[PDB]
């Protein structure tokens, strides 16, 4: 009864963990997200993996999961493990609100989920969670935030994020087009449109294959704007006219 045992916890004799890296290489496929925090708001971007013509789009949601009033998360990896994670995460934030009657700050939420993931990395032989996922949100102490979960339990705040293997060049692009706090909400959207236009190899970026949701700060509302498709269309037209204006320099 031990020769069948798969040993997904014991270190490898190369020097690192073994199953952890392969969960990372399971992150690398089927997924490509980022967001752009650079004032008054923060956004998320997403690629349709099932962009087939025979779906319904009746969920009024996609990759985004509004997990509270003031936080959502973008998924990349195996989807339904993340549903297990979103249910547990939503329930964690809601029990915190039950305990204090004040909304949940974003880093102890992230560290709670990171301790859950490390709890299945550390002991037993259980299969690790093959899900990395993002975080947007608001607090009383820092404003708008961005966080990067990893299947190890390691996290890290960013100002311009990355999950999927197609988006490492996006991080190169985010550095080459880095701004010091300039999110008028049209500049950041045009930059995100430019990034997803270049990094995905889908020619000219059909707007049904993308997804953009924003989070702005209102006094009593903290609205999360999972925006509709027409503004995405005119955003694509704006960016393609600006690419035609930009290649007048040749």
């Amino acid at each position: 009864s031990r020769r069948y045992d798969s040993r997904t916890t014991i270190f490898s004799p190369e020097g690192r963990l073994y199953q952890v890296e392969y969960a990372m290489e399971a992150i690398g496929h089927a997924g490509t997200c980022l967001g752009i925090l650079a004032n008054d708001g923060v956004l998320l971007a997403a690629e349709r993996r099932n962009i087939h013509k025979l779906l319904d789009e009746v969920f009024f949601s996609e990759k985004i999961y509004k997990l509270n009033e003031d936080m959502a998360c973008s998924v990349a990896g195996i989807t339904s493990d993340a549903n297990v994670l979103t249910n547990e995460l939503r329930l964690i934030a809601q029990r915190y609100l039950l305990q204090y009657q004040e909304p949940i700050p974003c880093e102890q939420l992230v560290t709670a989920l990171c301790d859950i993931k490390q709890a299945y990395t550390q002991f037993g032989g259980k299969r690790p969670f093959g899900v990395s996922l993002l975080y947007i949100g608001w607090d009383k102490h820092y404003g708008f935030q961005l966080y990067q979960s990893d299947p190890s339990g390691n996290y890290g705040g960013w100002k311009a994020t990355c999950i999927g293997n197609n988006s490492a060049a996006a991080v190169s692009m985010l550095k080459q087009d880095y701004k010091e706090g300039e999110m008028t909400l049209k500049s950041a959207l045009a930059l995100a449109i430019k990034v997803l236009n270049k990094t995905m190899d889908v020619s000219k970026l059909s707007a049904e294959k993308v997804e953009i949701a924003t989070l702005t700060r209102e006094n009593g509302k903290t609205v999360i704007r999972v925006l509709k498709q027409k503004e995405v269309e005119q955003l694509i037209k704006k960016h393609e006219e600006e690419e035609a204006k930009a290649e007048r320099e040749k």
Partner: protein
């Protein structure tokens, strides 16, 4: 048994207590301290069943220190008060209840001062001036006579002087010395110990 008063101001909180430790019929200790510093701007006093007071200080005090050391910053007074109410409300319907009756005193940078008010049945309250005990009765008329929401702190000290002068006038108890704190934007300031010379 006794009562410790908690007068709230515009931008300060005036809390006080006794130095009295009851027994069978004897006053065992005449320099007792009921003050439990939760954080840099949140105090806590406790009166009730006298075995539960120290352990409440243990539970609440140490879990607030855990939050402060974990996340990097101080609680609001409101969330701390609600957390105390939650642990009371959970501890009520069991085989082991706690019997305490104390109000909570905090100060936010944004919300400013805040006064809360418990009971032995875990009820929250947001009060301008509150009370418990038997000194409650003889003192809230005097306090509700001379109250102005925009009152200065030396007037509050004089009002507390007056309130004590009506505590030593028609009471069946001793109550010789009272300690007095104040909370401001600067933190915890200890005022002088308020006694009367007897002989």
């Amino acid at each position: 048994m006794e009562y410790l008063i908690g007068i709230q101001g515009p931008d300060y909180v005036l809390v006080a207590s006794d130095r009295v430790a009851a027994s069978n019929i004897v006053q065992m200790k005449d320099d007792h301290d009921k003050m439990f510093k939760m954080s840099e701007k949140i105090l806590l006093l406790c009166v009730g069943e006298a075995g539960d007071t120290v352990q409440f200080a243990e539970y609440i005090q140490k879990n607030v220190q855990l939050y402060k050391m974990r996340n990097g910053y101080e609680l609001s007074p409101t969330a701390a008060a609600n957390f105390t109410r939650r642990n009371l409300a959970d501890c009520l319907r069991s085989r082991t209840p706690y019997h305490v009756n104390l109000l909570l005193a905090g100060y936010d940078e944004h919300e400013g001062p805040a006064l809360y008010y418990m009971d032995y049945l875990a009820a929250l309250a947001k009060a301008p001036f509150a009370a418990h005990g038997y000194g409650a009765f003889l003192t809230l008329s005097i306090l509700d006579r001379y109250y102005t929401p925009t009152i200065s702190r030396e007037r509050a000290v004089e009002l507390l002087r007056k309130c004590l002068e009506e505590l030593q006038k028609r009471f069946i108890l001793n109550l010789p010395t009272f300690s007095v704190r104040i909370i401001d934007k600067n933190g915890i300031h200890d005022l002088d110990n308020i006694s009367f010379p007897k002989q």
